[PDB]
Amino acid sequence: PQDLSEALKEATKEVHTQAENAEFMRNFQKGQVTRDGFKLVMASLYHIYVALEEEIERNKESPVFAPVYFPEELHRKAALEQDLAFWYGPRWQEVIPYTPAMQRYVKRLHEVGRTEPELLVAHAYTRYLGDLSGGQVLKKIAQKALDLPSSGEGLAFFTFPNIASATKFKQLYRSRMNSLEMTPAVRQRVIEEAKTAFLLNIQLFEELQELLTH
């Protein structure tokens, strides 16, 4: 559907729904999340965002990504470092898990950023705007399900400090993404990569649930 954002929304409708219906995610949404479950999602995000930001930095000047380069408004690496220090302690870096599901997500991010940068937009869009859009709801759900201590740390990931209005930001981001010049072949691959992004998350949810039970 003409605008890239709309074509993405239509093509990923099924996989997006499946991501929401995935047991671990479905449960998180229903308020059924444990401290162990929550810590794993946080470790996962840390790995994903380290990888994504590394590739964004490498391709920030390229006309195939520049329009969507918003370093100050969206970077999450530092927020996640801050959160992990609280969830895993001062030695979090050497104690956080790094499972195969997380590894294959990181792997794809690096493949894209290194050889197919024109597809990096698909991951940035789905990861950043998805996290930005549902951050406030999952934050609250976690607050009452986790029963955190009043130490003012651990949930910075859910707050984008340099974005005053999420609604106006997403509008600017969408406009910038729709502004990208793409040949027919390029576009179809970006759409396919968007599906890939949702599928990597769905596989991650499956593994996290598996680790919790077993």
Ligand X SMILES: C=CC1=C(C)/C(=C/c2[nH]c(/C=C3N=C(/C=C4\NC(=O)C(C)=C4C=C)C(C)=C\3CCC(=O)O)c(CCC(=O)O)c2C)NC1=O
HSE-CB at 76 with a 13 A cutoff on CA atoms is 27
Instruction: For residue 119, state whether it binds ligand X (rule: CB under 6 A).
Output: no
What character string, x for contact with ligand X (CB under 6 A) and - otherwise, covers 42-71?
A: --xx--x-----------------------
Phi and psi for 148 in degrees, rounded to 5?
A: -65, 160
**One residue of 46, 70, 158, 169 binding ligand X per CB under 6 A:** 158
Q: Which H or E element spans position 16?
A: helix 13-21
Interacting stretch for ligand X, rule CB under 6 A, among 58-66, 79-87, 180-188, 195-203? Answer: 195-203
| Nearest-approach distance from CB 129 to ligand X, in angstroms | 7
Distance separating alpha carbons of residues 134 and 93, to the nearest angstrom: 27
Nearer to ligand X, 103 or 183 (CB): 103
Six-digit token pair at 33?
């999340």
Nearer to ligand X, 21 or 93 (CB): 21
Residues 128-147 contacting ligand X, CB under 6 A: 130-131, 134-135, 137-138
Nearer to ligand X, 164 or 181 (CB): 164
Six-digit token pair at 203?
């596989």
DSSP annotation string for 66-131? GGG--HHHH--HHHHHHHHHHHH-TTHHHHS---HHHHHHHHHHHHHHHH-GGGHHHHHIIIIIHH
**One residue of 19, 56, 109, 120 binding ligand X per CB under 6 A:** 19
Instruction: For residue 196, state whether it binds ligand X (rule: CB under 6 A).
Output: no
| Nearest-approach distance from CB 94 to ligand X, in angstroms | 20
Short-list 106, 107, 169, 99, CA closest to 135: 169
Contact 65, 117 (CB under 8 A): yes
| Nearest-approach distance from CB 43 to ligand X, in angstroms | 8
The residues of the shown chain that bind ligand X, judged by CB under 6 A, are 19-20, 25, 41, 44-45, 48, 123, 126-127, 130-131, 134-135, 137-138, 157-158, 197-198, 201, 204, 208
